Amino acid sequence: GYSFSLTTFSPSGKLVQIEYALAAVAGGAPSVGIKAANGVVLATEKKQKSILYDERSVHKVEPITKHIGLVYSGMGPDYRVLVHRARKLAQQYYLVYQEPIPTAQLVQRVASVMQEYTQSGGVRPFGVSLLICGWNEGRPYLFQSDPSGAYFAWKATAMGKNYVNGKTFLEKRYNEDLELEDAIHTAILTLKESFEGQMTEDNIEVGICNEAGFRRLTPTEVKDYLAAIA
Amino acid sequence: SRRYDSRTTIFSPEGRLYQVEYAMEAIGHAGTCLGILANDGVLLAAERRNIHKLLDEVFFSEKIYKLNEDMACSVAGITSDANVLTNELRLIAQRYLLQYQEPIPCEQLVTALCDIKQAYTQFGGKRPFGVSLLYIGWDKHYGFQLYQSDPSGNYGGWKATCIGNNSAAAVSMLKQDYKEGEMTLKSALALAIKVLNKTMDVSKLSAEKVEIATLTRENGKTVIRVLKQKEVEQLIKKHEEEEAKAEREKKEKEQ
Amino acid sequence: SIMSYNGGAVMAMKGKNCVAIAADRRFGIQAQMVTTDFQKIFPMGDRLYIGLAGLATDVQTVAQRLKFRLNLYELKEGRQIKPYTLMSMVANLLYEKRFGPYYTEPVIAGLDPKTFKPFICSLDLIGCPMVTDDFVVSGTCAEQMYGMCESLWEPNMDPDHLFETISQAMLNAVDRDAVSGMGVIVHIIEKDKITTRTLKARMD
Amino acid sequence: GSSAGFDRHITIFSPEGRLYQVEYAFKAINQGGLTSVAVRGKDCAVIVTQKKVPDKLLDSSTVTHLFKITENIGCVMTGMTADSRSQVQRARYEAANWKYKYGYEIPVDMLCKRIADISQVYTQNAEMRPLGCCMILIGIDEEQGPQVYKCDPAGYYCGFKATAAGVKQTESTSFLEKKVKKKFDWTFEQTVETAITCLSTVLSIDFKPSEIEVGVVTVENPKFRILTEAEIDAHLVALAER
Amino acid sequence: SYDRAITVFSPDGHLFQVEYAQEAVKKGSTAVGVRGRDIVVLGVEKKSVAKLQDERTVRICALDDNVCMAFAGLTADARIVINRARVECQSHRLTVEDPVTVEYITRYIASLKQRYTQSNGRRPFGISALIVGFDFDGTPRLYQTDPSGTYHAWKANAIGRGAKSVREFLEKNYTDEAIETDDLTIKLVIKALLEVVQSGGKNIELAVMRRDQKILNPEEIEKYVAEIEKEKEENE
Amino acid sequence: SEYDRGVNTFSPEGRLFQVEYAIEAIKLGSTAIGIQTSEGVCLAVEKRITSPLMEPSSIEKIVEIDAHIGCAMSGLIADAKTLIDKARVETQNHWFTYNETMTVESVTQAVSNLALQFGEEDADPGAMSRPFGVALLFGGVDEKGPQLFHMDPSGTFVQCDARAIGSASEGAQSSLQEVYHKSMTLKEAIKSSLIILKQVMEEKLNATNIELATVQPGQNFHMFTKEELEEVIKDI
Amino acid sequence: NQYDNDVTVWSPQGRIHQIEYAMEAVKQGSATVGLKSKTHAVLVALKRAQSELAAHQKKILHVDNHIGISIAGLTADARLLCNFMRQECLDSRFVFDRPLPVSRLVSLIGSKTQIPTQRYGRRPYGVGLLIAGYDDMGPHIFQTCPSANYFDCRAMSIGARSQSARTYLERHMSEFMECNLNELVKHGLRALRETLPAEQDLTTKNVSIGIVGKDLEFTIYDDDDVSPFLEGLEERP
Amino acid sequence: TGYDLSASTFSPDGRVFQVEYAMKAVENSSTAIGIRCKDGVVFGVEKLVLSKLYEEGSNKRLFNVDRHVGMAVAGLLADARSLADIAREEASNFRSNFGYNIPLKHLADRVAMYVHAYTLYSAVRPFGCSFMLGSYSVNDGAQLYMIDPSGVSYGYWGCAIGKARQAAKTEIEKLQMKEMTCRDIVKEVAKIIYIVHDEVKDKAFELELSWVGELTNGRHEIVPKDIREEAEKYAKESLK
């Protein structure tokens, strides 16, 4: 292997490989996350190129534990690597402390993993950003982790293509007293703001966290919500 | 392999370590952190770069980290590198407590971290850590202490100092207004608000843009406290009242 | 037996909104007494305590390593540890040395840092947790303590009656064991105060 | 299409967030001049590949891109031949180890996921290059039916109703899209007919039994089967009499 | 691990990295050492920030009870080298049961620096050192080490910025009269430092070492500086 | 650029670049002369003293390998310390195992084995990154009599009758050609070497700026004291 | 040039320039000749050093009672290879109580030398070898090149200006098989003389000889020992 | 641009140029030929003699990899020898683990994978050799495989490697080799070798012949001298 760093400092003080990874993130499919009073909603666009694609095969919304869920923007293979790492970390925490891991702890450990790839030898950063949802201590959590290894806590946020417009939309439409159904409607509206074509239950993917846990919505439920929106 | 090697740990023809200088440039652009040492306490004051309306409050602080029962730090630069370094600082302190069964002195912790940071400038072919740190603490040998460290592995003890954006102007103001040996925590908080007022020129001073942490001794225990937004708003109101009074007395002289 | 080399007895008891933890004070090498103020109960929180019985070197080693791990946990998490989580942490520490065991048996007594619910548990040589609603004992005089505790314990005791019960149990149990005794110390843990008492005991 | 540094020589990011070496690895698949089509049906999965023997001095048995991973999983490889063989060996090892560790036969989707995970490492570590090969897997899952999966050098894997790989992939994709939109739940004969017709139409070649290879899997016989020349000729004469 | 060759030869027979480390030394603070009859004198230039520096835990460092060191160059490198030297001094006390000789510790430090000019994955130390001390037989000793591993013994020397000028001054002013008493040697050191250090004597730290045993506070340094200005005026 | 080539790269003419550059570093050092006679071996070197403040007694260009073997060094003197320690350890291990003294040729061969052991990869941690910038002259007495050997950074060692190494080697070698005969006495050899050294040195030869050592059959390794040096210098 | 600095880089012509540069080291070195009769094997070496005081550098080395080698190029690489060969022969005697066959030794050398030519940051061995040996199959002369290629020769010369020696040997090679020892050695000496500039001649100082045979351990004749052979050698044309 | 300096670099059009340069190294070598008939395999090499000082049997290009398996190489001889040792070790390990003689297809696959492992990294260089493996057994019959510097292994009826490969292939296609015997094949191999040799550029050469079949009891060996000299007579007659 190569023992030297591929990410170095520029004369202006920038780590330019991290910025190019962020450029990879900004070209990906849009993702939205909203924190309601009783839950969290993560929504993404999976617009396949052809009818030949079997929609039940690959999922962009993934469970990490019973109460933690993940979504991404950027490069998919890197996302799979990070999902495997996160699931292993949660299992190690459970084996040591006999408790399901808090969301913030998972975010911190995964962000450490992402930082390692900005300084290790012979590797590039991860070209993916992550939205993390959880329910701990009777309270919902939403976090964002970027290629550098930095994590932020959000009430609502958007990632991917047209994320600035999504941010303004969410600013205008977000409220503290939102309940989860209103949040789901708002998330689908944010995705509609930047969508080409007809939004069906098969080209978007939604997941929700509440007191019962994290679950991925079936296409039937998404069709019901889409009929409500339209 | 030789073709792709960036050669981070070598000398320039002028004796300079270029990656360290570039990391110093990175620190010059981060959020401001000032530390002020008093007779009864020590304080850290940072500016918050996470000021979006859709951001959520959780945890304890954004830039202030608690390393021990008696020590705390504030970081400027790359945040992920800061997370790495603070984890390592906590580990060093707990290893000392295991070995000697006493709390670690502050300068020993700073020296250990600075040895780690010097290692990255001399061998390994990896990039340095782009983070400067301010440390505040209390130990039984020297009392209340304030230290600074930079990516080269250099550290120094200070009575008042600033790192980050516009730190030279802040240091000039501190040199002008710091009173040696006659400083209380209250007057230190006033001075911190004044310096942060002149350093945060891009946007004027509101409580949601600053965080203040205090270290004091009470009944033989060390207390580290992050000020609530109420107290910071009180401090800013006091600053504005004092400034208005000074302006009025300035307009008083001619009549 | 390598456990009986130094002796020692620890006991934990459950009340109504309170917990009590008691220990003996002797430090000795087999039959010889060395000191009469040996610490066997350590604070792991404001309302959480751990008592260790067994080989005194392992007692001190385990206490110090446990404080290492607990301090790191509380710095990383920004919270105070729950008693069940501490039980799991201790069990993990003890089972990491499965084939080179620490010769200590712990009891944990505390109140939950939010709902203030009593918790007591015991762990054996390698870390099998035992959670009980009445009492737990550990040491060289375990059978004696078992008899006293089975005879005296009642549900829903107030702090004063809990103190009387645990004090009588410990005193009368250690009076029948040769390598345990030389004083008893009791901690009564409530929501609003910790009460530490030293008992008038036999010094023979 | 900007660049800065060694971003065209190693797997690092370009200013636009692209990995040029992965795109060049995709270009490598088209070197070889072959095309493959995989089609899924009601109870069957079929892979049809182009077979070219330039030399009469070549032993035609050894020129094959259809491989057997387990008794029930089959694959067709497209691209650089040595890289393809390397990936086939890796897949066989992984399936055998799954059977040893977990006690049941590996699902097709999990095998594709493992292969794509291995491929991702080559796009993150700079001392190795990607493999210039595409893998198509077919199998029968006793809960979901026929399965057709594809993995590429980037680390992407997906499951398909029908797919193609190679030089003429875009035209074959268009043909199959039209055929799938007019949906008929395909019988075994209809599936084989569809695959062979796609290959013929896109290549503009009337096939001789020796110019193609066909590999099938069915619910009734779940074992991966390679068709002999007689069976292929039966299918071809049926296609002509249409 | 990182196994690149950093220090290599150039076409003219030069080790460029060593020369660049010598440039780094040339950028550092000025240190002057004078060897006396009974004392050894070590003076350094201070970079002082007005009112804001805390100089309570800062010391010119001690390797043992009997050896002192002054450095010029990269301060973090100097800290590393000092800690290694201290560990070696304790090992020598353990293994030989006698205190170190000044030359022994100088040899250890020079060999460490040379090792870093010929190892894979490492750059040279950017520090030059002056080492002063007393042997068991009570002879005063002063040694200098270079980033390349070259160590010599000197009567008077200077390292750091403007060390060439200070060395010319010492060459013209180091005579046997000037070493007769402690005050004359301290005046020689202070004059040499004043050659290149400007602003005055508040930028000067002075340490004096005596047999089987001293830091000059600012007021005594000012006393000596006033005496020097007097003796200079009496030339006219 | 400096890092286009590796350290183990051949030139189009068939020579390792780093070795050629190190041999060029040899030309920058002080002049050492060695003469072999039937009565013993003479080694003379010049101390290159840069300042009057330097104590010439800390310059060791001639060392004792064993009671029968001595070495004179030219070039990058700090690099020579590793080789000398290896030589001393080899001679003592030989005495431990075989209860006899080593031959000069065996010592030279053992030291020459280290010369090309440099590289970047496929080498153990603690391996060398560059060649050695020293030339060595070994002089000793064994059962074959008085032996003088020359070693250069390439690893090549030869046996010589008279030999000069360092900056002034070519002219000194010509003079040695003129004055050497097989029937010389050790006193004549000492005088001739000092005459040549005086000829090539840029300073004036006195008893403090040179070193002389001899090895004779029966007498051990001898470093000339200042008084014996003055006795010899009087004749020149 | 971007193709001439590493041993791992192929040129567009299909060559590795570092190996050719390493062969240049053998071409620069001093010349050696080797020849075999039906009973003996002879190595003749032209010793030289930098100056007259500097004794002529050692070119013929002793490997085993039945094997000796001559050197051209980098002497330290030659000593590395010599130590490797000595250890291999010793291991053969330890395990099988018999001498190692010469062909198997040359195979082991070729295996050792090829590895560095395939790995990054390594270099070839800049040494050319001539191996003289005797075993159950008779006398053998072998040549080793830095490219890791080895040859079984009837006769061979390597070094500087060795083409003239090779020409002489080709002209006279049919005689060698039927010669006695002195005649064979004189043939080798004449071939070696063919490389010297026209003024230089063969003296007892600049010539080393190495002989192995049916009933003779490998012997190195240097100095007075070579006077018996240099006797009766006609002047050059 | 430097798209051709490492084996871990693709060119914009999808080519690894270092492997292609290794193939160029193979094309400069002298020609080796292998012909397979129902009962065996015959190998023929044109071995150029670069000087008359070289013995007969110097620089052999035909190797015994196993008692039933033979190898014919072209390109860089040192790389070929290292590969021969790799193949020998593979065969030995197979016999020690599974207890019988390795099948030729399996051996070819293993060696081809070892060769392919050198086409992926910047730390190693591709092999500059191509080779043919030939074998006979009663169960498997007669097998002839060829492996190139990229790691591709294919089975053949007739194969040629080196400088005159195309002309040799043209000559091999004129034989109905399936219904021929090994004795006829030796004479035809010698004839083809003598046809493709260029006397003007290449001076002189030896003919190296070997075979494996039921005639040899599944043992790979050098063709006996009388058969070789008879075949050489036939070849020289055919050239007029």
Author numbering:
A (entry chain B): 5 to 234
B (entry chain C): 2 to 256
C (entry chain J): 2 to 205
D (entry chain A): 4 to 245
E (entry chain D): 2 to 60, 62 to 215, 218 to 240
F (entry chain E): 6 to 241
G (entry chain F): 4 to 240
H (entry chain G): 6 to 245
Publication passage describing the model:
The 20S proteasome, a critical component of the ubiquitin–proteasome system, plays a central role in regulating protein degradation in eukaryotic cells. The inner two rings harbour six catalytically active subunits (β1, β2 and β5) that possess N-terminal threonine residues critical for their enzymatic function.
Marizomib (MZB), also known as salinosporamide A, is a natural γ-lactam-β-lactone compound derived from Salinispora tropica and is a potent 20S proteasome covalent inhibitor with demonstrated anticancer properties. As expected, the atomic model obtained for the h20S proteasome in complex with MZB closely resembles the characteristic architecture commonly shared amongst 20S proteasomes and displays C2 symmetry, with the two sets of 14 subunits arranged in the conventional ring configuration of α1–α7, β1–β7/β1–β7, α1–α7. As expected, the carbonyl carbon atom derived from the beta-lactone ring of MZB is covalently bound to the oxygen from the hydroxyl side-chain group of the N-terminal catalytic Thr1 residue in all proteolytic subunits. Similarly, the orientation of the inhibitor is consistent across all three catalytic sites with the cyclohexenyl moiety occupying the so-called S1 pocket. While few hydrophobic interactions stabilize the ring structure in the S1 pocket, MZB is primarily coordinated via hydrogen bonding. Lastly, residue Ser130 in the catalytic site of the β5 subunit appears sufficiently close to coordinate the nitrogen of the γ-lactam ring of MZB via a sidechain interaction. Using a concentration range of 0 to 12.5 μM of MZB, we could demonstrate that the β5 subunits were inhibited with an IC50 of 18.5 nM while the IC50 for the β2 and β1 were 326.5 nM and 596.6 nM, respectively.
